[PDB]
Amino acid sequence: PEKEETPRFVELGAVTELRTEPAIQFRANQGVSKRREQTKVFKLTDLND
Amino acid sequence: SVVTKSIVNADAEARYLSPGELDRIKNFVSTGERRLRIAQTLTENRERIVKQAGDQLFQKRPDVVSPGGNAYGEEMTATCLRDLDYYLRLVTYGIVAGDVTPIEEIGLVGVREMYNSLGTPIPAVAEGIRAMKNVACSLLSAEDAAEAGSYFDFVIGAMQ
Amino acid sequence: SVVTKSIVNADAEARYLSPGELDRIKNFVSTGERRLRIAQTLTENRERIVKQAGDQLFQKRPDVVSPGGNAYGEEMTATCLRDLDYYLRLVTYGIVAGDVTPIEEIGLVGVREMYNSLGTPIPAVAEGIRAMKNVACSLLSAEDAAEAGSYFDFVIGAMQ
Amino acid sequence: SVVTKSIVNADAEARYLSPGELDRIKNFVSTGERRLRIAQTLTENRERIVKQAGDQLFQKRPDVVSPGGNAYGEEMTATCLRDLDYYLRLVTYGIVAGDVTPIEEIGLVGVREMYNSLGTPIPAVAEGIRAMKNVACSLLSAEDAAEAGSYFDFVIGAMQ
Amino acid sequence: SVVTKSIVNADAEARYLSPGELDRIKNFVSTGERRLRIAQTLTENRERIVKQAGDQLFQKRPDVVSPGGNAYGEEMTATCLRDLDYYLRLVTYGIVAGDVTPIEEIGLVGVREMYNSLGTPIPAVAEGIRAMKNVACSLLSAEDAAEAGSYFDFVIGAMQ
Amino acid sequence: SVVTKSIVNADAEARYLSPGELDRIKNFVSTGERRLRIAQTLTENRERIVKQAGDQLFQKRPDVVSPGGNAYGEEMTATCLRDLDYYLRLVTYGIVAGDVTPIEEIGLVGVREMYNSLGTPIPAVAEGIRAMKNVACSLLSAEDAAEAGSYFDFVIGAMQ
Amino acid sequence: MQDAITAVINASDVQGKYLDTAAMEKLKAYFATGELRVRAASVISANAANIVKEAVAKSLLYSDITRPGGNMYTTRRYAACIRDLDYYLRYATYAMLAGDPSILDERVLNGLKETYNSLGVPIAATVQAIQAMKEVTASLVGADAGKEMGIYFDYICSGLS
Amino acid sequence: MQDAITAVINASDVQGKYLDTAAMEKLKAYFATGELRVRAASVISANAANIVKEAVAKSLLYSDITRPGGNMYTTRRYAACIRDLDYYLRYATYAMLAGDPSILDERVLNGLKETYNSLGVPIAATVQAIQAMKEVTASLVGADAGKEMGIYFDYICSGLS
Amino acid sequence: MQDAITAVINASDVQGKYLDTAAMEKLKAYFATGELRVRAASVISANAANIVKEAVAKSLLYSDITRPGGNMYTTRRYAACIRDLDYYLRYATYAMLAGDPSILDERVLNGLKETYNSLGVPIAATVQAIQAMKEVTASLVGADAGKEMGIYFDYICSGLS
Amino acid sequence: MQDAITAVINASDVQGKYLDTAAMEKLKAYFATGELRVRAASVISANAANIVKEAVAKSLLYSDITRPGGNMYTTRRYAACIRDLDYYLRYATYAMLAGDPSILDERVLNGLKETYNSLGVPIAATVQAIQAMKEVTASLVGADAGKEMGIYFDYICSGLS
Amino acid sequence: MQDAITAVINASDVQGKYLDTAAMEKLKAYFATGELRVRAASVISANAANIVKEAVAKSLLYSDITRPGGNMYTTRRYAACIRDLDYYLRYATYAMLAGDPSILDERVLNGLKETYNSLGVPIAATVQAIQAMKEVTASLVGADAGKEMGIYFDYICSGLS
Ligand SMILES: *[C@H](C)[C@H]1/C(=C/c2[nH]c(/C=C3N=C(/C=C4\NC(=O)C(CC)=C4C)C(C)=C\3CCC(=O)O)c(CCC(=O)O)c2C)NC(=O)[C@@H]1C
Ligand SMILES: *[C@H](C)[C@H]1/C(=C/c2[nH]c(/C=C3N=C(/C=C4\NC(=O)C(CC)=C4C)C(C)=C\3CCC(=O)O)c(CCC(=O)O)c2C)NC(=O)[C@@H]1C
Ligand SMILES: *[C@H](C)[C@H]1/C(=C/c2[nH]c(/C=C3N=C(/C=C4\NC(=O)C(CC)=C4C)C(C)=C\3CCC(=O)O)c(CCC(=O)O)c2C)NC(=O)[C@@H]1C
Ligand SMILES: *[C@H](C)[C@H]1/C(=C/c2[nH]c(/C=C3N=C(/C=C4\NC(=O)C(CC)=C4C)C(C)=C\3CCC(=O)O)c(CCC(=O)O)c2C)NC(=O)[C@@H]1C
Ligand SMILES: *[C@H](C)[C@H]1/C(=C/c2[nH]c(/C=C3N=C(/C=C4\NC(=O)C(CC)=C4C)C(C)=C\3CCC(=O)O)c(CCC(=O)O)c2C)NC(=O)[C@@H]1C
Ligand SMILES: *[C@H](C)[C@H]1/C(=C/c2[nH]c(/C=C3N=C(/C=C4\NC(=O)C(CC)=C4C)C(C)=C\3CCC(=O)O)c(CCC(=O)O)c2C)NC(=O)[C@@H]1C
Ligand SMILES: *[C@H](C)[C@H]1/C(=C/c2[nH]c(/C=C3N=C(/C=C4\NC(=O)C(CC)=C4C)C(C)=C\3CCC(=O)O)c(CCC(=O)O)c2C)NC(=O)[C@@H]1C
Ligand SMILES: CCC1=C(C)/C(=C/C2=NC(=C\c3[nH]c(/C=C4\NC(=O)[C@H](C)[C@H]4CC)c(C)c3CCC(=O)O)/C(CCC(=O)O)=C2C)NC1=O
Ligand SMILES: CCC1=C(C)/C(=C/C2=NC(=C\c3[nH]c(/C=C4\NC(=O)[C@H](C)[C@H]4CC)c(C)c3CCC(=O)O)/C(CCC(=O)O)=C2C)NC1=O
């Protein structure tokens, strides 16, 4: 029969910890504040607009 | 996503969402089913896309899998394919999100710095993603393929 | 217009129009027929929309047309209906444009300053435009009325 | 309610409620407690009342429940019992109301058309209501049986 | 709660829950539905319990509602009636929880200090709660009344 | 399975499944969820059971692992532990299937021949499976452990 | 239209369940109120014309509305104003006895505001007159009856404005 | 004879894998739908004679096959036909219970086409009869289990074809 | 800041998995409810000032707080109070549009209780005010959208507590 | 300290309402799940030593941490490390039995950060160790109970980090 | 910034008149050509790098200007020159999409002469180069689109001159 094994690349990039809501809430919001990219910067590019 | 970008841009100006933005999010909402379908196709054929696109990449860049290349050997070539798999996953995220923000933040800010630390060639990573785009387009219909191909195009453009 | 606003944002970030932005430009141009049809209905019924809605405004706010009020006398009431006429015209322009930047550019930047200088009550002007919106609902089919209603919504919201 | 029927007549007459009409409303007010008690008895003995009525109706017309009959089979027989239960609940509502107004709007307008469409036999339904009337007279006081029998009788006549 | 009390004791003993303590938790789990129904009927008859028991209390202790008493004046009497409602509420919580932990935490701890400052006689408060226990007993079956009565008994004993 | 056992017995006599046979199938399908859970615990802990049971087998029967024994060296001790894993897998199949037919077909018909050809001592294999049974009982709850223990017991009996 | 009893019956039919204890006490509240309702209705019919006269005298009579160019400054206009007030009063008395606002919604308050607006009759003037009629009616009917009549008349006035 | 449960475990055995999450999902599906399968099996068991009767009537009676010079002519041959139709029904019910067509393959279809070609039995008429049974049993057992039965009845039809 | 789609893809990214079928479910549900969200946002954008106006009148006016010595007294503090209500309503519409409460926690409720305690603002009174806003905004948007607005107004209330 | 029941009644107490039907539904759900919780606690209490042993072996052993100068080197520190792991597992099962994480935050994670920083304990190594505990205990108690033990273990991880 | 629609409605606004049928005709004409404008924009967006490269090679390269002392010499100067050509092409595509020259006139052309003269950048060479860009972009987009683009390129040329 066909062997039907997983490829190695699946295993290499698979997290095997069964993360749950507290872990996902933390591990998704780890790092510098998202307001570094969730902001806007204003410029007086054209006095006419 | 489009919704979060609109909310961010409006919060900075302290303005409730203008009708110009509200129609944009309404459009994205309406085409959501097609977007989910495209992503579902890509995740179904995750393993085929990565496998054969990687084979194309190694065919066009034999130096990469040749001895002394970055992805030389069984485990090293698997990590190279793992990176391609990561970018496919980011592409599906971007497709359902409706913008390139998830792709940009998760995997294109400092991509050159990371790959130069690793010693990997950025143009060869770009060609691998190009091969993935070709395979994914073959698995999509013409309208579906061109809608997703733009996310692939953003990824390769940042790689360059 | 949608085209000019998309161009402005792309100009700020120094990018040629994205494929999705190009799709939106194409879509707006194609549905321009429906846009023009809605505007044609409103300009066809300029007389009754202003007249009926203004009478509803006077009844809802008797104090504006009372003695010692801003609209006392037929001369002043004629000017008040003239203002409602101007705002309906701006709304038709906005429907044609597909964006509220023409409406804002012409008649919502500084309305508080102008009307307070005149002594006119800004909330009362908002309620008159609300009356115009309610009159518009009967004149326009349900699908059409939602499209025109959003422009009316922006006018009243800025007015308050 | 009886008051509702009197109000409808008064509205057609374009006159305030007649003194005699108000007198009947007063009688309905007096009999509210007795009517509620009778309705409570019916609701309390609901399952047994319609169970016995169903047995009696199937005995009277065995082709309702026989092969080739409308209610042939357990599921359709249960549905027939539900239709009888709908009628029983309507009769309890009507006893509380003191008038035929509650029933007429529910199960006495167009009921012939609905039953003809589904295929159930209208005469057999009427007999089932009659069986309910007998069971209710058994389970109620003598004058309680008279009033409840009157409301039941209007339902039976409506089926005709 | 049974769970919180068992875990408190086990925490002090620094032991994983003893098999017997787990067995008690199992039995509390199974009897929870009966507890919920008992609490349900108490809250459904909240109004009758409070007014009936309060009138019993005032008969038993006319001094409190007499002039020169704590509750004299409709407003003061009403606030005492509120206190009786509060304690019934705590008792319903305790019946659901399975222990006095919620009852004593929310109220009944600094009870003497609070009521000494307020000026009320705490034995008179206990008499009111006893009257509530009697009314609740009448509203419950003999088994159910025993379970609820124990929590009422704890409350009155702590008041004294 | 139990479905197959019922169907085989029915086929032999050329009769539709008797009501008793169908009763057994209904019990088995209703109990299937707990069966799958028991099997899942064994599969999830497949490494612990084999490792600890292997140690117990090697303690109790040191001759097999001693030099000159069948399982001498890690090369051959690996094969012995693999066979213990085989029989754990068969037991999980049996728990899911509800019968010992999966175990007996795959790995109990001719164990005497197979192991006597490989030279392996069958009584020692039996000790290994008994050790697996004890370890699995530690992992499983008592009620579930009894059910899984039956399948382990069938295996040890077959190899005795 | 609807009644208190009929509305509870409708709600029970929506729920799909036979008369509950909650249904029983809601109906019983209507049954208890019936005596007050019917007595007040007889009083309202007896003094109906006087009620209209008192209300307009208290609110709109001897005012600019009655004076020329005030929407009531004609014999026909004045008669129409009295007529509409009587229409509201009669339907309100109906609705008070019924216990539900469905009658007022179905007949009294259907398109009335739009018709009044297009005519030019002042909605605020009508609302003031309705409140004056409510005061007169409460006085005539009695304290308990006035509270219920206030609720029904309040529905009419609020719907008009 | 091999169920869906035995099929799932045997496939995992061939791969040498413990029952994984995907195969366990297959098993969960079968266990969940087992109640419907069992009840339908009881229904067909009780009404076996009626199912065969109605099918023989709908497709085979009053035709060349029953008239002299046809296959079903003679009571011998007719009794054989109804016997074989019940065999097709009984084994289809076995297969529905199990969840696998292997029982049909091993016990019924293992040479059936050759036997019917040897005796001269009309394969087309047998197919018509089995499809008639499919219709009748769908009515008796309901649509939900009728589809599940229908796949196995179609299996027999394909094999005989 | 997040939305429903961003939250789903971020959770999947944390677990290093392509979008699950359950994740696809959540995405579909958001898309199904999305157009309703957009319409509701348009409604309360138009009536934002009116919603604040009604809520202020219905709980914060003619009360000890707005009378001298009650914090809301003084024109400064009145302007600050109504501005805070506009903040709460605007961020509630942001949260409703996004389908996620992360905006409320990240930009509104972080440090808000600490600042209110330092300022002397009554956290209880602000909670009452925004619940009044919840009633008004529910009436304007409709029942379905009002539910959605409520699950974010209540979120703000809980943060204030 | 709180329970699921205690949390529900305390929330209703804060609002000042007798237990609503929604509150009753929460309580009924906890009662339905109580047996499953009791089973899982019985399992890991028996295997507590094994869970700690496996987690220590999988992540904490044969590394610099347990070789000279590693904070787990020295028998006193090794005993302390395994004692902390049993602390974490015992309180995690307390929280699982309660159905509320208030136990963990009130007891386990009050200044635990600060103590470990003072002591020099590597927070990251402890988090890795209790992650290994989570894997072992999830396998023992099963999937549904494991995802309940998992959230409490991850709550402890987040407090440490 | 202005476009075809903005120009039409602006002219009507100066007139103080609602949209005339002639104005609607002008809008219809712009809508008719908007389709071709979109695809031309897509084409030169993809080939923008090639277009600039080809024009630079055609006229700017292998000249004394890029030889030492020619002001295009030095890598910084070369990067600035191709940057300006990128600017001109991007603004040209914006104007082509809009159907109006307002963006060029205000965002680009004003002050550009003063800066170029002050810095010493050769305006004649820039005009020649953008002329070459115009030829290349016309070939890529097509003839009809090239007509649409070329007017804006010439507009920029006149502004520089
Ligand atoms: C690498 C060994 C580990 C790691 C690091 C990591 N760091 C950041 C972010 C920041 N780190 C610093 C620290 C410094 N600032 C300094 O000036 C100096 C030298 C005096 C140091 C060491 C700061 C300020 C930041 C935040 C600002 C920033 O963006 O850099 C991150 C997060 C980056 C982000 O969120 O975008 C990370 C991941 N991460 C690892 O896994 C290693 C163990
Ligand atoms: C008459 C004495 C009784 C009776 C009979 C009845 N029979 C049928 C139908 C069929 N009968 C046969 C019989 C035979 N087939 C054969 O090959 C032979 C031997 C050569 C015999 C005797 C068959 C085949 C049929 C089926 C129809 C057909 O011929 O194709 C019916 C019709 C039943 C139906 O609805 O199908 C009846 C009524 N009925 C009586 O009342 C008598 C007591
Ligand atoms: C009925 C739908 C049609 C039909 C059939 C018919 N069959 C036979 C005789 C035989 N049938 C079989 C078939 C099977 N053997 C099996 O093991 C199975 C599966 C469990 C099947 C289906 C065999 C072996 C025979 C021959 C021995 C016997 O007579 O039983 C006959 C009789 C033919 C004869 O010569 O005696 C008939 C008539 N005939 C029809 O008209 C229908 C269309
Ligand atoms: C007055 C000449 C005009 C006018 C006023 C009017 N005001 C209100 C209501 C309020 N006014 C205040 C004002 C203040 N609060 C302050 O703290 C200070 C500074 C010390 C001032 C001046 C406030 C708080 C209210 C709200 C009600 C309250 O106090 O709780 C009303 C009532 C509005 C309503 O419908 O509720 C009115 C009518 N009205 C006029 O016609 C004049 C031109
Ligand atoms: C109104 C319902 C109640 C009330 C409010 C009140 N608030 C303040 C002052 C502040 N409020 C905030 C809150 C926010 N800042 C924000 O950016 C946001 C959105 C992200 C919120 C919600 C802050 C920062 C301040 C202080 C700075 C400032 O003045 O803006 C005051 C003023 C208090 C003072 O005297 O300085 C008041 C009065 N007051 C009430 O009575 C209501 C119950
Ligand atoms: C040898 C005489 C006996 C024996 C021991 C054995 N020990 C281990 C593993 C460990 N031993 C230690 C011991 C210490 N840690 C300390 O800090 C100190 C004080 C300076 C001591 C003595 C530790 C920490 C370990 C853990 C592994 C590690 O160091 O990383 C093993 C291995 C156990 C295993 O299966 O993993 C063994 C076998 N075994 C015997 O048979 C002797 C009787
Ligand atoms: C060189 C090892 C690689 C390479 C280069 C290559 N360059 C050109 C053309 C030009 N190069 C320059 C460079 C400079 N201009 C400057 O002012 C300075 C600093 C003082 C530098 C370094 C310029 C201006 C040109 C344009 C032509 C010109 O000088 O006018 C070419 C020709 C490209 C063409 O097809 O036209 C090439 C091939 N090519 C390689 O293969 C090497 C890896
Ligand atoms: C344009 C047509 C028109 C007319 C005519 C008109 C009449 C009119 N007459 C009124 C009063 C009145 N009219 C009379 C009339 C009379 N009493 C007598 O004894 C005499 C027999 C008789 C006149 C000769 C009286 C007594 C009142 C006052 C009623 C009161 O308030 O007690 C009023 C109510 C008070 C008011 O003006 O607010 C009106 C409106 N209104 C109109 O719009
Ligand atoms: C759904 C039940 C119903 C309503 C509500 C109704 C109202 C109604 N009021 C009308 C007019 C009118 N209504 C009034 C009434 C008033 N004059 C005043 O000063 C007061 C402010 C006010 C009430 C006290 C007047 C003056 C007219 C116009 C009469 C005319 O000039 O011809 C008309 C136009 C036809 C007419 O002239 O009668 C309608 C249809 N008709 C209805 O069938």
Coordinates of C-alpha atoms and ligand atoms in Angstrom, one line a residue, chain I residues 61-63 66 73-75 78, ligand 4:
Chain I
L61 CA -29.6 65.8 34.4
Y62 CA -31.7 67.3 37.2
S63 CA -29.7 65.2 39.7
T66 CA -25.1 68.2 38.0
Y73 CA -21.5 70.7 38.0
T74 CA -19.3 73.5 36.3
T75 CA -19.4 74.0 32.6
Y78 CA -20.2 69.1 32.0
Ligands
LIG4 C1 -31.3 80.7 29.7 C2 -31.3 82.2 29.7 C3 -31.7 80.0 28.4 C4 -32.1 78.5 28.6 C5 -31.4 77.6 29.3 C6 -31.8 76.2 29.7 N1 -30.7 75.5 30.3 C7 -31.2 74.2 30.6 C8 -30.4 73.2 31.3 C9 -29.3 73.3 31.9 N2 -28.5 74.4 32.0 C10 -27.3 74.1 32.7 C11 -26.3 75.2 33.0 C12 -25.2 75.2 33.8 N3 -24.7 74.2 34.4 C13 -23.6 74.7 35.0 O1 -22.8 74.0 35.8 C14 -23.3 76.1 34.8 C15 -22.2 77.0 35.3 C16 -22.2 77.0 36.8 C17 -24.4 76.4 33.9 C18 -24.7 77.7 33.4 C19 -27.4 72.7 33.1 C20 -26.5 71.8 33.8 C21 -28.6 72.1 32.5 C22 -29.2 70.8 32.6 C23 -30.3 70.5 33.6 C24 -29.7 70.4 34.9 O2 -29.2 71.4 35.5 O3 -29.7 69.3 35.4 C25 -32.5 74.0 30.1 C26 -33.3 72.8 30.2 C27 -33.1 72.0 29.0 C28 -33.9 70.7 29.0 O4 -34.8 70.5 28.1 O5 -33.7 69.8 29.7 C29 -32.9 75.3 29.5 C30 -34.2 75.5 28.8 N4 -33.3 78.2 27.9 C31 -33.7 79.3 27.3 O6 -34.8 79.5 26.6 C32 -32.8 80.6 27.6 C33 -32.4 81.3 26.3

